[PDB]
Amino acid sequence: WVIP
Amino acid sequence: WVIP
Amino acid sequence: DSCIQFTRHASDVLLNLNRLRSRDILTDVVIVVSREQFRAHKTVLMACSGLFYSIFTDQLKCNLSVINLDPEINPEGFCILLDFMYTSRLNLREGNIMAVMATAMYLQMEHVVDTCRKFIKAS
Amino acid sequence: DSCIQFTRHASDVLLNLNRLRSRDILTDVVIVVSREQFRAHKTVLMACSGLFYSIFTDQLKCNLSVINLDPEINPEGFCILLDFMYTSRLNLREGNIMAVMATAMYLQMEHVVDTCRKFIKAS
């Protein structure tokens, strides 16, 4: 999971 | 396009 | 094999499937969550959820145009997860994380359950 | 928004859609190319091809279970492109590049047409  |  | 690969292909496919959903094009099922109705594509639901995968591979349920979820399922939690299915983006907030995790556990969306468990553990 | 994103989600969705295709699950159309028949999901075809997008948004053609391609279309070229649609992987070879480019131009798959033009220019 990432900060888009 | 890439070499997978 | 000796194949070449287009990096953005999967993302572009998902973007177009979401455009079809937004325009209600070739949607073939309505998911009923309490009073709320959500139109979607069975194939995308199966691709994202262990529960929908089991439902639509069933020789009888595969032909249903309406699926009613357990009355304990929260419509907002389902909406957030349906958006995630079609975008890869999860609107996880303090006010919705419990309903999102419970809905993801019911829908069998393992990666969402994992990030909810981690975000809850941090607080 | 304040969304988080699961990097592998789109790829995992496409992988599952290909698993459904391989098992002939919820396929809703057969694409006829000369003597050859290819089963697929209309939504995936639309998501990948400008030609299929136009066909299945048509108020009459949207309901057809069989689509016949132009007799000039090569079945192997179509097969390679259908595999690409469901995998992001293109089996581009010296012996098939002309048929692949011609099929991609007909199907309106702009990124495939672009890599074929570049690979031809290099030789």
Ligand SMILES: CN(C)c1ncc(Cl)c(Nc2ccc3c(c2)CC(=O)N3)n1
């Ligand atoms: C497991 N399998 C062969 C398969 N093939 C096709 C599809 Cl559409 C599918 N989808 C599915 C099944 C289980 C789970 C998911 C999708 C997401 C998840 O967390 N569990 N799973």
Ligand SMILES: CN(C)c1ncc(Cl)c(Nc2ccc3c(c2)CC(=O)N3)n1
């Ligand atoms: C253009 N548009 C709004 C849109 N919405 C939904 C879908 Cl499924 C779609 N697909 C499509 C259209 C044109 C092209 C492609 C897909 C690939 C391409 O090279 N051209 N295009």
Ligand SMILES: [Cl-]
């Ligand atoms: Cl997930």
Ligand SMILES: [Cl-]
């Ligand atoms: Cl393309």
